[PDB]
Symmetry: C4
Subunit: 333 residues, 4 copies
């Protein structure tokens, strides 16, 4: 008898992938109210954040202003790599000189990326993010391993992005201090349309965590978070932090100017694989509603997270990571 969806191979369709909108967190017994919840969580093996949020390494999201504001809000920014090495290293220094704030910076793969990494380390960066669409490529695993052996106890090395248990395991073996998850889910991502490739993000987190948690390696959920409720869902699936692009792109601190249209305000937001950022693009150029100061956006996001922690009876993010989901049907939206 055939597999009900076709052919005779039961592993051809390997999984059923759930995204954020497919699940809700179940309320549970609680002695936690939103006010008493503790939102701190590991970004990497060595680095703990007060607020488990990181801004995306995108040229419409994180330059020094955003990185400073994120660190002051208890999270962290990852400086984007679409600018000369000297300028990126300069922005690292601008952040570190603003009171010894934490900061990360993105690098790619290869010789130029190596020079960039060494300059960032010299400028005092806390976290290097090897920042790629496909960390299961051998070249990315090599870059992560080479960085960790060279500068590994002066700096934390994050590898990404992955969407499977096997890819997460490979980054763990290469020595990553955190594993970043997300292939396909970004709001400005067209990888699913252009390449037909991706993994729904709740399932991707569940799978990456199955490799990373037994190894003591934190998982960063990256892409597709549209609402504060999604942050609670990502962390409950086992992520330790979430990386945000679109939710932060509309803020005052994000690079780019205010666009006034029809009495409404917008800001430019674009994929780092868009034509404008870079050809077969895998990102789009768009705009998002203007959201005002970063500090207030983060307060709303953390407020939603704290509500989820109270509903699930989670005093800490570590307990939130043990919460359960109910799956919902299309009618549920």
């Amino acid at each position: 008898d055939p597999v009900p969806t076709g052919g005779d191979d039961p592993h051809k369709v390997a999984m059923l992938g759930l995204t954020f909108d497919d699940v809700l967190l179940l309320p549970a017994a609680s002695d936690v109210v939103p006010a008493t919840a503790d939102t701190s969580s590991q970004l990497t093996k060595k680095i703990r954040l007060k607020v488990p949020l990181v801004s995306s390494a995108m040229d419409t999201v994180t330059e020094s202003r955003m990185a400073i504001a994120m660190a002051r809000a208890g999270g962290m920014g990852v400086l984007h790599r679409n600018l000369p090495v000297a300028e990126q290293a300069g922005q690292v220094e601008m952040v570190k000189r603003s009171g010894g704030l934490l900061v990360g910076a993105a690098v790619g793969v290869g010789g130029d990326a190596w020079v960039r990494a060494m300059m960032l380390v010299d400028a005092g960066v806390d976290v290097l993010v090897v920042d790629t669409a496909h960390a299961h490529n051998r070249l990315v695993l090599d870059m992560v391993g080479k960085l960790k052996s060279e500068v590994g106890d002066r700096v934390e090395v994050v590898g990404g992005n992955v969407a499977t248990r096997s890819a997460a395991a490979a980054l763990v073996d290469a020595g990553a201090d955190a594993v970043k998850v997300g292939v396909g889910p970004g709001s400005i991502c067209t990888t699913r349309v252009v390449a037909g490739v991706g993994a729904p993000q709740i399932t991707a987190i569940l799978e990456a965590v199955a490799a990373c948690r037994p190894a003591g390696v934190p998982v960063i959920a990256d892409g597709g978070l549209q609402y504060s409720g999604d942050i609670a869902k990502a962390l409950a699936a086992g992520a330790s932090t979430a990386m945000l692009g679109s939710l932060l792109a509309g803020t005052a601190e994000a690079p780019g100017e205010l666009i006034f249209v029809n009495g409404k305000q917008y800001k430019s937001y674009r994929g780092m694989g868009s034509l404008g950022a870079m050809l077969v693009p895998e990102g789009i150029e768009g705009r998002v509603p203007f959201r005002g100061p970063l500090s207030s956006v983060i307060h709303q996001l953390t407020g939603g997270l704290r509500a989820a922690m109270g509903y699930t009876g989670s005093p800490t993010i570590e307990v939130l990571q043990q919460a359960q989901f109910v799956r919902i049907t299309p009618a549920g939206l």
Copy 2:
């Protein structure tokens, strides 16, 4: 082999949650026609209603005018608690002086809520509703138990809201005279977006009833009812009454004035967790179509319920609670 939706824990995604739109009632053998159906049902252990409908404890739904009209229609109102204690107690007296009509009133948790409760009991209220977003919080279970031990044979004590079997069981153990179900489903609810928390309402009722029915405790289905057909579905899932917000907010008797727009009439309707009602809000402020007199709305809702009773062969609500569902696909809408 992994769980097909991710990870190695088969209980991480604990349930598949159905909402009202996911199911239909199956017609069955019948010697009932809508005219002969008996719609009476227990609100609490001690209180039976002629019509199994309760109006929401919301400041755009139930003040004394709505409570009087609901009781005269054979149901009951629950007076909202967004007003001073003296005024809420006054409205209880206004209802009781209108012919010994049944009335309930909402209270929260804590010292002020206690003073409020004692005043309501003194004013002659029939039902206290401990009225919270999360009754599985230890503080709410304590409030329910404290009220029941103190004023428990003078007044009925309802606890809510819950969305799981374990939460319902906890309220039963605390001594609730009814258990109110609904976390996430309200029309003006943004808990699912803000906190990422909720449970689809048919599954939530089925689970709460699995704890409550063996204990002889009635379940009140609260939130997400959009159509008269949903009332029949909630009761068939095992609820004994339904609580209505949006379906009653448009009525003449609801608080608030008529809004004339484009020759159409509306009334304000808002969550009790909205900014206007209260910060990270979990409700919105909106409007609903004006619906005319409450009496006529209730006649239409009970007419739909009676039709369902005839189709399912249910002469009483107790038999309707034994009816079966067919699940439908998205194509079914």
Copy 3:
């Protein structure tokens, strides 16, 4: 362990109901081309149609003009019962005098319905349709049995509507010469919203056929057919004929006049349970695009059916009833 959708009763959600849009017919080996297919099929035990289509007993679909045109096209009309007995009987005579054409007529339940039935039989009707929303009501089963024992070898007696195997079996036992299926699916039906009751139509046909086929009783699929492809699907699920309302309401022969709007033409179409037709209505009043002559509409519908017969390798409707489905996902629409 609970049922995954809630509670501890695996039969509470009894079925997964498929509708027409949930399935496609699988192509199969074929020596049939659309031109050679034979579309004849049993309407009842004793009556075979050349084209397996019947027009709905609705006052915006079938009066004598439609009945004459349907019979001439190789199908049949069922005259509606929203008119005096004398007038309905008169229209039966008008059809029979137009060349001994087949005709049916609807009756309800009770004394007045009985008088109506006797007059229709005297006027020479071929088929009485006991025409109700819920044939599993004991009163309807009694009417079917009483008619069959009284006038049963002069006239064929159809009973409906049902949506389950048990209801179909009950009509078989009462002596129905055909069983009509459809509770909830009609285009102008609001039973699913008002009463929350219904059964998706492919599953309803599959279940009714499981009772009717072993008893040699034909099944009429009634309601929810939107496209010619749906007729092939209904017959493949095991129905022997299909009854059409909305697909025929726009035709020249349907009662009602042409409505000109924005250079487009419409005709009124309304449920027989609508306010205008009859209170808690379970039908709506609307309009449908004007479609021109009935003869041309039937040619298009039979052409689609013949195409399906060629694709499935079915030379006759009896072989089409053995065809298989593939289920499709929401993405499939």
Copy 4:
């Protein structure tokens, strides 16, 4: 106990059919970057293409200009058969005289189709495509066998279209040099609405490949490809090439003129079963956005395919055919 979807036959609903939008390709371990991927693949047993793309045999897609451009781009065109034999044969000669480019041409079934085929072979065509809606009809299998025995080592003979394992197996037995898959999926196809017949295309490919691959016969995925990502999905499901209609209809090289509307440009695109092309039509007449030169469209499509190959670690199309899918939910779109 009944089948959960109705009746007592577990094979009545035979399969669950997935389409392109139901799945994503899973990233895997990779030493492939888009630049190093090899996109060559078998069109037929004897013919390999550099780019695994074929243009549809439609009179709004492929005449000699499109066929020349497709062959120069490394793919192939199939000349449509809605024109006199002499003219179609002439266009074959026009292509062959443009540098010994590969070309195919469509024929139907019967005596006239035979004369057409012989003229095409004499004009030097490389591939005859027996071009029908239903190749599991005995008449089509006979045409394929007759052509292969008569002209079979001078020319390759493709048979289509099929949507099942059994139909693919029948074409293999008849001697097809490739099997073309797609019943129902075309953008301008109304077979699913008119006849109610079809098979979702990923499942159809998986099933056809289960018959064809063990026989060494290539599968051409035909219809429903909307995005470059769909090409990667079709090939991963086991197809060896993809045939494109709508994605190529907007190009400069496609037959038909530019339609200027609202400052936007369009081109006519119509099914070959549409009224205009040919009655009960199973295709529609429409328009598609103007896309510019074919060469640039093919570069974008191959770029998406190469990205998918890098993500899946596939250096060749043969390895891409071993990639795995994750199924997504409706929420996933």
